[PDB]
Short mmCIF file of C-alpha atoms in Angstrom, two decimals:
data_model
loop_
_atom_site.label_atom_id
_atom_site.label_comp_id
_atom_site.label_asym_id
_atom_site.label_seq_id
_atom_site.Cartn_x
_atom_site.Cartn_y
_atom_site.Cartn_z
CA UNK A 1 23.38 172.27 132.09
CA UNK A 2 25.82 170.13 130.37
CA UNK A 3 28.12 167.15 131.45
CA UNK A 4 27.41 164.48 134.24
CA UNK A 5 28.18 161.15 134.21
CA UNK A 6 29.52 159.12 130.60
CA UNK A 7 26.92 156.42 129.73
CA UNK A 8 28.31 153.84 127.31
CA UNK A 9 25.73 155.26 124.61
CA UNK A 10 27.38 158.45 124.52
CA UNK A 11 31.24 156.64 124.42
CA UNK A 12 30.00 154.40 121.23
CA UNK A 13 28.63 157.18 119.39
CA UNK A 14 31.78 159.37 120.54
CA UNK A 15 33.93 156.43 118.73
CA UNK A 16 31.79 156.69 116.13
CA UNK A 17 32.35 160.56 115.74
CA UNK A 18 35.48 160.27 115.75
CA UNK A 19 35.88 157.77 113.22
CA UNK A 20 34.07 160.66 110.78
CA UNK A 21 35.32 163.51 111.76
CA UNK A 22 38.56 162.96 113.43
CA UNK A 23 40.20 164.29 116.17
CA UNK A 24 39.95 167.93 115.82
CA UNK A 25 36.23 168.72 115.14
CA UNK A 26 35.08 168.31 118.49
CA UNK A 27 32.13 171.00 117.89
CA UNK A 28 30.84 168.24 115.43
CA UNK A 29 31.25 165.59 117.61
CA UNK A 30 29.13 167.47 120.41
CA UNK A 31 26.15 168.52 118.16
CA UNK A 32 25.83 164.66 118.07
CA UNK A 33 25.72 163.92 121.59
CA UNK A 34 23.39 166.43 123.17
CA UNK A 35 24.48 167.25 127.18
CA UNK A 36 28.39 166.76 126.11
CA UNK A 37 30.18 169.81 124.88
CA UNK A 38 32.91 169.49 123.04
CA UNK A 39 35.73 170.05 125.79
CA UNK A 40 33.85 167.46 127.76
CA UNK A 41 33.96 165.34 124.48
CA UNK A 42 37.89 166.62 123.61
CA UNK A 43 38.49 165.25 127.80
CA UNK A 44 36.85 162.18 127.87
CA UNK A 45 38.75 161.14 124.16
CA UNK A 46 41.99 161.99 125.60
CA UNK A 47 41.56 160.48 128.93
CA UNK A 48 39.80 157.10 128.56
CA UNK A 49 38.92 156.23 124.68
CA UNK A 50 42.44 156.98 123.13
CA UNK A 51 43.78 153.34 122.32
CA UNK A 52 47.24 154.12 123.89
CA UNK A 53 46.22 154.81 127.36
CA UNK A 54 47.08 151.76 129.17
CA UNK A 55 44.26 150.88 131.47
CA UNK A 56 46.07 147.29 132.57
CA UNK A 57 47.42 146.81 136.09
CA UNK A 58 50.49 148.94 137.22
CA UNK A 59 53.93 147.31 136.91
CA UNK A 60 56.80 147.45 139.54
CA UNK A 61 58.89 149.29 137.14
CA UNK A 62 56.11 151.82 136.13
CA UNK A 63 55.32 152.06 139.91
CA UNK A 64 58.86 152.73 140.56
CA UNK A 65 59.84 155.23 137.68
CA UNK A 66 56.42 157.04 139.15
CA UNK A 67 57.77 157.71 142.47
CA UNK A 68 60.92 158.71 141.37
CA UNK A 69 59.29 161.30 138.93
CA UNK A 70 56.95 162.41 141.64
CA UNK A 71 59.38 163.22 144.52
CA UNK A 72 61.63 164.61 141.30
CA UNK A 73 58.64 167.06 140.20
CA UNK A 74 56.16 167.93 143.12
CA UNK A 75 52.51 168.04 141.26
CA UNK A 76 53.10 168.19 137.67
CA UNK A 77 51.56 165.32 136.49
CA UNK A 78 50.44 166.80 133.40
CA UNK A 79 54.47 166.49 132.84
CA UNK A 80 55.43 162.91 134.20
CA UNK A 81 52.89 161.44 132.67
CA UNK A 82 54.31 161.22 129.07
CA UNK A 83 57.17 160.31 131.08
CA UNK A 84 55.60 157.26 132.32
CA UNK A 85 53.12 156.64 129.93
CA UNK A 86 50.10 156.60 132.11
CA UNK A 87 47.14 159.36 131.87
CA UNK A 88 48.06 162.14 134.65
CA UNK A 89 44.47 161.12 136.62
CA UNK A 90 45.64 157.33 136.28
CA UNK A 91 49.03 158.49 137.45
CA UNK A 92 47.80 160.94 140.35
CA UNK A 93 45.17 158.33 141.79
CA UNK A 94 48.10 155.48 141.84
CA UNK A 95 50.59 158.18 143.52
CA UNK A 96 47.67 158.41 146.19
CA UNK B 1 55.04 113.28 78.92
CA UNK B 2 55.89 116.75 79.00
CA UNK B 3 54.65 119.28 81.98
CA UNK B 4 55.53 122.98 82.36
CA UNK B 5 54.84 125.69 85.23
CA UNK B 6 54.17 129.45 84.27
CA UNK B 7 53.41 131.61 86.89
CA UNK B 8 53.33 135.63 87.03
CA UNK B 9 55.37 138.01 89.06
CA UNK B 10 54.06 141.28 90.01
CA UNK B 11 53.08 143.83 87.32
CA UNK B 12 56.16 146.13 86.73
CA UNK B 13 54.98 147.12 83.05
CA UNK B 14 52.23 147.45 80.89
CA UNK B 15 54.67 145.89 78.39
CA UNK B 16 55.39 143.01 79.98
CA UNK B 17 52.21 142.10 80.44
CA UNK B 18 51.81 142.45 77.02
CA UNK B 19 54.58 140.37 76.26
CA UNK B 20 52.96 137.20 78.41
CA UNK B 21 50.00 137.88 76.73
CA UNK B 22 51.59 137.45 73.27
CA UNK B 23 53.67 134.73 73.78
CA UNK B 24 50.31 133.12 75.33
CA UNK B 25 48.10 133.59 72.05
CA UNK B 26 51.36 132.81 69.79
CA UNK B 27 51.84 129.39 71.15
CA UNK B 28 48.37 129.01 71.04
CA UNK B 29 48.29 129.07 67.17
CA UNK B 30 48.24 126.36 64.79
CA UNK B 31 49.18 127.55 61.20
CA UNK B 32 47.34 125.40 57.79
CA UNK B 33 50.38 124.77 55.79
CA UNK B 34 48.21 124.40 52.81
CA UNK B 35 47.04 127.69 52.51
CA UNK B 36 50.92 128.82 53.22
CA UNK B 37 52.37 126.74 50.47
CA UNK B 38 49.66 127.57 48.03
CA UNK B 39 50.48 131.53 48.34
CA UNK B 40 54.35 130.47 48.37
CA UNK B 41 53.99 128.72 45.25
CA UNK B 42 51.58 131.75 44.02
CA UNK B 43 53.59 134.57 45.17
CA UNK B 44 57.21 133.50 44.38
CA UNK B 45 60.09 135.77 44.54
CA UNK B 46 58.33 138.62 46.94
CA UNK B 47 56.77 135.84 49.25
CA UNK B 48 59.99 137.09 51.01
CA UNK B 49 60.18 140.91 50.91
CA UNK B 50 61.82 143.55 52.82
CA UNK B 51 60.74 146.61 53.94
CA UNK B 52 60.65 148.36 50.96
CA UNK B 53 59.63 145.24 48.64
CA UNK B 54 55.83 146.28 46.51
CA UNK B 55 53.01 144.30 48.66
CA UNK B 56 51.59 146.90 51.04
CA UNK B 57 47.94 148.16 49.48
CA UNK B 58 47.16 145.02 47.82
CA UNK B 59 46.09 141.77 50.69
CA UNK B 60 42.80 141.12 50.35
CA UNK B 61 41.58 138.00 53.12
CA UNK B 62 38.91 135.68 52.50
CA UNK B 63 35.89 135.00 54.28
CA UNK B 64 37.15 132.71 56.43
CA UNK B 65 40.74 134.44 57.28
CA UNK B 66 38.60 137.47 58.97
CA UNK B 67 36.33 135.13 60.02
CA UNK B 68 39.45 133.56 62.03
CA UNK B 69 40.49 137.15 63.29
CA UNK B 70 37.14 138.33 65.08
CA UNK B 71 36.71 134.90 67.17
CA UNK B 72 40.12 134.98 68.25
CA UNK B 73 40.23 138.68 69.06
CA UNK B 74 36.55 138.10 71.02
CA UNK B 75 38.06 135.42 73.01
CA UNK B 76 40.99 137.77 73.90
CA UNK B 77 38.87 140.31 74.94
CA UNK B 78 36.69 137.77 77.24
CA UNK B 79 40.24 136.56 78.86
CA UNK B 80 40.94 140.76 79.29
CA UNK B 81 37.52 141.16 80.77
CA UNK B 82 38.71 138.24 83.22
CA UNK B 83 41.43 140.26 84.77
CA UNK B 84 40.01 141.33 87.93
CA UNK B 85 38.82 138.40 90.56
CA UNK B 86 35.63 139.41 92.56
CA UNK B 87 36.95 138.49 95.87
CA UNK B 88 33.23 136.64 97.48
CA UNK B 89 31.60 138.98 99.69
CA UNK B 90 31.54 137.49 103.57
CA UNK B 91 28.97 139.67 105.84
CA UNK B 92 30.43 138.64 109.48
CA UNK B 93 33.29 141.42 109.57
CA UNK B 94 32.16 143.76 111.44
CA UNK B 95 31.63 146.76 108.66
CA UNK B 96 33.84 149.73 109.22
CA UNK B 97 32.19 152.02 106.49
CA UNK B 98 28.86 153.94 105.70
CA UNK B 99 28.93 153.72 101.82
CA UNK B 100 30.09 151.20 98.74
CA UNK B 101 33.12 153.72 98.30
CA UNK B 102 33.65 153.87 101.20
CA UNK B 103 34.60 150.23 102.05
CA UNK B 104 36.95 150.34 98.61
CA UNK B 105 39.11 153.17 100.52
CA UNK B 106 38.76 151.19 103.79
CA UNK B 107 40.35 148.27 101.35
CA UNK B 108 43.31 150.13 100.16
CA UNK B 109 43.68 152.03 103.46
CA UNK B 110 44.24 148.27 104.75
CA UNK B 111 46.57 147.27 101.83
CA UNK B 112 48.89 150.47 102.53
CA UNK B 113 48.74 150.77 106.57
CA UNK B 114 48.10 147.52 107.54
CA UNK B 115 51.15 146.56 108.23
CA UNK B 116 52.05 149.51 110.63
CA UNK B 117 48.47 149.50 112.59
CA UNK B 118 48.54 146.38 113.79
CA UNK B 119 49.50 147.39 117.35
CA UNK B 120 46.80 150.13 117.96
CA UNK B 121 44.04 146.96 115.98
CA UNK B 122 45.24 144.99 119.18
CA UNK B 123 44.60 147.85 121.59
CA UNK B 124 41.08 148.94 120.32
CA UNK B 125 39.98 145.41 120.39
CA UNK B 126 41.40 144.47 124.18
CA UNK B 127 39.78 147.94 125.27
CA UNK B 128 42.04 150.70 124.63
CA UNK B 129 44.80 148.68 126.67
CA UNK B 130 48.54 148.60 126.52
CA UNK C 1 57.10 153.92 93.74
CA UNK C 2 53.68 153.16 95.91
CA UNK C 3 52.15 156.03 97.26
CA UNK C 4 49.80 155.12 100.13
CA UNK C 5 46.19 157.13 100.19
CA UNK C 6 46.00 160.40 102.87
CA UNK C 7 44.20 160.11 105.57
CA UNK C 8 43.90 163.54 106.69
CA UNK C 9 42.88 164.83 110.36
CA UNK C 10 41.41 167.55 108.97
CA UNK C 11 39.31 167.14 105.57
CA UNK C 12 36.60 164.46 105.20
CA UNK C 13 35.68 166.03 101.69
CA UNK C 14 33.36 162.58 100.42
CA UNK C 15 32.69 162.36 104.37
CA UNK C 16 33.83 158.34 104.56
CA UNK C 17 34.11 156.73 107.75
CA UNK C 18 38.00 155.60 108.62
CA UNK C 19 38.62 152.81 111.38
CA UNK C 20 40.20 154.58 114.78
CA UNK C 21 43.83 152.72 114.02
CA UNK C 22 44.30 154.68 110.23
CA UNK C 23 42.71 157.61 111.37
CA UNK C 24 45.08 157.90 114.95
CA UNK C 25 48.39 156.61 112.41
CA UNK C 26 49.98 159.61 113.36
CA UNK C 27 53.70 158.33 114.43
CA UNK C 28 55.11 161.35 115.00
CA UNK C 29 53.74 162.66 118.21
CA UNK C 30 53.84 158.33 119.40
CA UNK C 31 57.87 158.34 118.72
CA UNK C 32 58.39 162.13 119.93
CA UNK C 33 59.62 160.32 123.13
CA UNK C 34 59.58 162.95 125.79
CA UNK C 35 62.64 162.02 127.51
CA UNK C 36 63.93 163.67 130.66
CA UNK C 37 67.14 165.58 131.58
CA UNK C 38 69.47 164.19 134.79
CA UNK C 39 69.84 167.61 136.04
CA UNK C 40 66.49 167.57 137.24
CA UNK C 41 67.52 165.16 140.30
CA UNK C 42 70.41 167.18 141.68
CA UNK C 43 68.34 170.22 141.92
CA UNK C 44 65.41 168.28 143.71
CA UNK C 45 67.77 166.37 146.39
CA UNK C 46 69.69 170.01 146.73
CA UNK C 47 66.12 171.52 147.63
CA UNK C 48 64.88 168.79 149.76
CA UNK C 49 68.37 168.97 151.67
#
């Protein structure tokens, strides 16, 4: 009875959260935003608020270096994607 | 016409900002030569002692010599009292802190890591990008 | 002979509020630079073959 969709409410007060109680109290964080735990909170930090995940347009060279990892390591994306600097959801939906 | 320039460095020392200090207030006296030649003429041969020469238990100053003393001193201490600049308070930056401490760490925590966060500033402003 | 203030990850002990850029200044794990072996690709093309 948690979880659902992420309302912009819940992201700006996430941000907020973090900015007080960094980036490994995430059990503080979710007694602030009420149906969020703090994995879901932990996730959603890690795979669309951390300000180094590039959400910009794919390059050629990213695009390229992407399908050589991915015929070089069949499904691990959880391991190319430091590789290529993309989230591994970001990185899996563009191999699609 | 005469013209001179005197800025400061950076701190480095409490003594040599004590040193600018006292070369400030020591051009900035002006000495009565009549009093001067009066105890010269008074005082004679140990108007120019040593260290060892008799004179030290016996000055008493006048009025006017102490008098002298406390308004200069007051006027150092209201130039010492001058040292820090309140830097004018602008209200359209967007506040980054919940408390009046707060914002003073936010301040140094700017002075020391500005320089290096100033790629991740970009990113959280463009939304999270690059 | 600066030292610049800690901004922990951990302790918030007069619970301030940091910006997102001091707090995530942790360079360490942004210059670890996972960086891949070439031995990877001969193995791969030798499966595939």
């Amino acid at each position: 009875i948690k979880g659902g969709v992420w309302r912009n409410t819940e992201d700006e007060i996430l941000k907020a959260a973090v900015m007080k109680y960094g980036k490994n109290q995430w059990s503080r964080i979710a007694s602030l935003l009420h149906r969020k735990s703090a994995k879901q909170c932990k996730a959603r930090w890690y795979e669309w608020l951390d300000p180094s995940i590039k959400k910009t347009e794919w390059s050629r060279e990213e695009e390229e270096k992407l399908l050589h990892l991915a015929k070089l390591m069949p499904t691990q994306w959880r391991t190319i994607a430091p590789i290529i600097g993309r989230t591994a959801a970001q990185c899996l939906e563009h191999y699609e | 016409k005469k013209k001179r320039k005197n800025p400061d460095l950076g701190f480095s020392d409490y003594a040599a900002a004590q040193l600018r200090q006292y070369h400030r207030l020591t051009k900035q006296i002006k000495p009565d030569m009549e009093t001067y030649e009066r105890l010269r003429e008074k005082h004679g041969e140990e108007f120019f002692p040593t260290s060892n020469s008799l004179l030290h238990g016996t000055h008493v100053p006048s009025t006017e010599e102490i008098d002298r003393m406390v308004i200069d001193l007051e006027k150092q201490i209201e130039k010492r009292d001058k040292y820090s600049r309140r830097r004018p308070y602008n209200d359209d930056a967007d506040i980054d802190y919940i408390n009046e401490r707060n914002a003073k760490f936010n301040k140094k925590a700017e002075r020391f890591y500005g320089k290096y966060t100033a790629e991740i500033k970009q990113n959280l402003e463009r939304g999270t990008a690059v | 002979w600066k030292i610049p203030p800690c901004i922990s990850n951990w302790k918030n002990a007069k619970g301030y509020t940091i910006p997102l850029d001091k707090r995530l200044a942790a360079d360490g794990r942004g210059l670890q630079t996972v960086h891949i072996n070439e031995n990877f690709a001969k193995l791969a093309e030798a499966l595939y073959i």
